[PDB]
Write an enzyme that holds these catalytic residues in place. Structure first.
Site, PDB file in Angstrom:
ATOM      1  N   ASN A  38       0.835  -1.209   0.000  1.00  0.00           N
ATOM      2  CA  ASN A  38       0.000   0.000   0.000  1.00  0.00           C
ATOM      3  C   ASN A  38       0.869   1.258   0.000  1.00  0.00           C
ATOM      4  OD1 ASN A  38      -2.465   1.373   0.240  1.00  0.00           O
ATOM      5  ND2 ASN A  38      -2.175   1.638   2.449  1.00  0.00           N
ATOM      6  N   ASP A 103       5.613  -4.975   2.586  1.00  0.00           N
ATOM      7  CA  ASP A 103       4.350  -4.402   3.117  1.00  0.00           C
ATOM      8  C   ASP A 103       3.202  -5.427   2.956  1.00  0.00           C
ATOM      9  OD1 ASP A 103       2.923  -2.134   4.357  1.00  0.00           O
ATOM     10  OD2 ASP A 103       1.828  -2.219   2.401  1.00  0.00           O
ATOM     11  N   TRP A 104       2.044  -5.055   2.427  1.00  0.00           N
ATOM     12  CA  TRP A 104       0.962  -6.034   2.280  1.00  0.00           C
ATOM     13  C   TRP A 104       1.294  -7.125   1.298  1.00  0.00           C
ATOM     14  CZ3 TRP A 104      -2.386  -7.174   5.672  1.00  0.00           C
ATOM     15  CH2 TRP A 104      -2.704  -6.234   6.640  1.00  0.00           C
ATOM     16  N   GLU A 127      10.924  -4.478   4.861  1.00  0.00           N
ATOM     17  CA  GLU A 127       9.835  -3.655   5.409  1.00  0.00           C
ATOM     18  C   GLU A 127       8.516  -4.414   5.366  1.00  0.00           C
ATOM     19  OE1 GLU A 127       9.240  -0.426   6.870  1.00  0.00           O
ATOM     20  OE2 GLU A 127      11.278  -0.819   7.607  1.00  0.00           O
ATOM     21  N   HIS A 269      10.247   3.361   4.651  1.00  0.00           N
ATOM     22  CA  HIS A 269       9.410   2.211   4.320  1.00  0.00           C
ATOM     23  C   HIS A 269       9.594   1.736   2.888  1.00  0.00           C
ATOM     24  CE1 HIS A 269       6.222  -0.699   4.536  1.00  0.00           C
ATOM     25  NE2 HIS A 269       5.594  -0.122   3.508  1.00  0.00           N
TER      26      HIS A 269
END
Length: 293
Positions: A38, A103-104, A127, A269
């Protein structure tokens, strides 16, 4: 750092939607599956894929509701993403893979690997999502903002009505300045406000301070698997990081089996935007020893 996206579009029909993906590189061999999070897309991988494509097939989907994929009216909960991605992987006929995840994309990749361990030859991650047990374990600089995102009123105002994830959180979590051309590539899927649902649901799904309970449990489950899996792992980290601060990277280096860690230098990130060349070249160099059964 390159701003272009020099990849031919490919589309596959999944669950009534077209999903867009990058597909480059040799047809044989073990494919490398790149999973964004995201509020990004396959664009995030644009400067990493060219290091890998010379030796391996590279497949980089845009998650449902994101990038150039279709936009069905879903809640865009994690479970929706799981269903579409599972169906994408089967539609391409993938057997064994190497995962490259963020991330996702990392929640999706680790959850798929836990369920399909015999099909994963390696995991490169950065991350990535782990349980954040309390709000004190979330970085101070982003705490008030993410707390506000995780509300039904204010968070929707910020993310959907004002585009805060695209205009605020994304560039704030790249150390270097993103250019306007880069920002426009990230903005394009979300020009219409109503299409920003996934951008709000994702931060509301993150496993923080025990909530939401279903995601905490699922993420705990894939982390337990990861800690006992022999699968080769390659972990990239930056300073100060966001989800994976330096001290946590060091702990994982020692705790995760068969794990190689790579310091990328400065990073928050979206590490891919700060040091894509090192990430890509290290992934490329790491792939060959994974091949032997």
């Amino acid at each position: 750092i390159g701003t272009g996206f020099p990849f031919d579009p490919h589309y596959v029909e999944v669950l009534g939607s077209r999903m867009h993906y990058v597909d480059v590189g040799p047809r044989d061999g073990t494919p490398v599956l790149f999973l964004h999070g995201n509020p990004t897309s396959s664009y995030l991988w644009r400067n990493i894929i060219p290091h890998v494509a010379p030796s391996h097939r590279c497949i980089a989907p845009d998650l449902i509701g994101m990038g150039k994929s279709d936009k069905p009216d879903l809640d865009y909960r994690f479970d929706d993403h799981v269903r579409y991605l599972d169906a994408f992987i089967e539609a391409l006929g993938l057997e064994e893979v190497v995962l490259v995840i963020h991330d996702w994309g990392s929640a999706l990749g680790f959850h798929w690997a836990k369920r399909n361990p015999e099909r994963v030859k390696g995991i490169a991650c950065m991350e990535f999502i782990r349980p954040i047990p309390t709000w004190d374990e979330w970085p101070e600089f982003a705490r008030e903002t993410f707390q506000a995102f995780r509300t039904p009123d204010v968070g929707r105002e910020l993310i959907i009505d004002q585009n805060a994830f695209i205009e605020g959180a994304l560039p704030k979590c790249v150390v270097r300045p993103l250019t306007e051309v880069e920002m426009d590539h990230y903005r394009e899927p979300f020009l219409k406000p109503v299409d920003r649902e996934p951008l709000w649901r994702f931060p509301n799904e993150l496993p923080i301070a025990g909530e939401p309970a279903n995601i905490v449990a699922l993420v705990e489950a894939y982390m337990n698997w990861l800690h006992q899996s022999p699968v080769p792992k390659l972990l990239f980290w930056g300073t100060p990081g966001v989800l994976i601060p330096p001290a946590e990277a060091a702990r994982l280096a020692e705790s995760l089996p068969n794990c190689k860690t790579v310091d990328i230098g400065p990073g928050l990130h979206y590490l891919q935007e700060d040091n894509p060349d090192l990430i890509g070249s290290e992934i490329a160099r790491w792939l060959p020893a994974l091949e032997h059964h």
